[PDB]
Amino acid sequence: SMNPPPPETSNPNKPKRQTNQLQYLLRVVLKTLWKHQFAWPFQQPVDAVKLNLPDYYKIIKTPMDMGTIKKRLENNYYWNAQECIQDFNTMFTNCYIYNKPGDDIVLMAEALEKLFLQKINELPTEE
Numbered sequence: 543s544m545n546p547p548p549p550e551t552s553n554p555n556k557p558k559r560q561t562n563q564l565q566y567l568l569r570v571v572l573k574t575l576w577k578h579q580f581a582w583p584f585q586q587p588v589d590a591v592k593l594n595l596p597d598y599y600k601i602i603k604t605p606m607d608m609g610t611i612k613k614r615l616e617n618n619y620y621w622n623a624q625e626c627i628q629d630f631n632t633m634f635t636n637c638y639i640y641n642k643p644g645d646d647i648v649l650m651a652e653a654l655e656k657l658f659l660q661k662i663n664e665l666p667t668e669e
């Protein structure tokens with residue numbers, strides 16, 4: 543049983559930007575989702591060993607989680623907001639791939655994803 547290396551959160555050769563939308567995504571969107579009662583399963587990479595889900599990383603080849611996204615934001619890892627939004631979408635999509643409609647984990651993702659879409663519907667305009 544082995545978890546893979548988690549996604550990178552630092553990369554000096556990546557071009558980085560401190561964007562008004564990216565600050566919003568950390569200060570407002572991520573930190574609001576982070577406090578939700580259903581956020582805890584998404585706050586770190588899936589530990590397929592602890593959770594005894596040995597087939598998780600057989601199926602999920604681009605893992606993502608809100609703890610990785612929080613580190614990426616706090617270390618100024620993104621060039622623009624769409625890169626950060628795509629990591630959220632990967633995280634939600636992975637959960638819907640590995641799991642089935644009706645699963646408790648999928649009810650949690652569906653709630654988080656609707657809040658997430660509410661919060662990003664309006665981003666501060668690129669000043």
Ligand SMILES: CCN1C(=O)c2cccc3c(S(=O)(=O)N4CCC[C@H](O)C4)ccc1c23
Nearest residue numbers: 583584588593595636637640641646647650
């Ligand atoms: C989001 C990443 N991710 C999955 O794809 C997934 C599949 C099955 C279980 C599980 C758990 S759990 O065992 O802690 N638990 C959490 C609360 C609701 C259910 O009871 C399951 C935590 C995080 C998970 C899973």
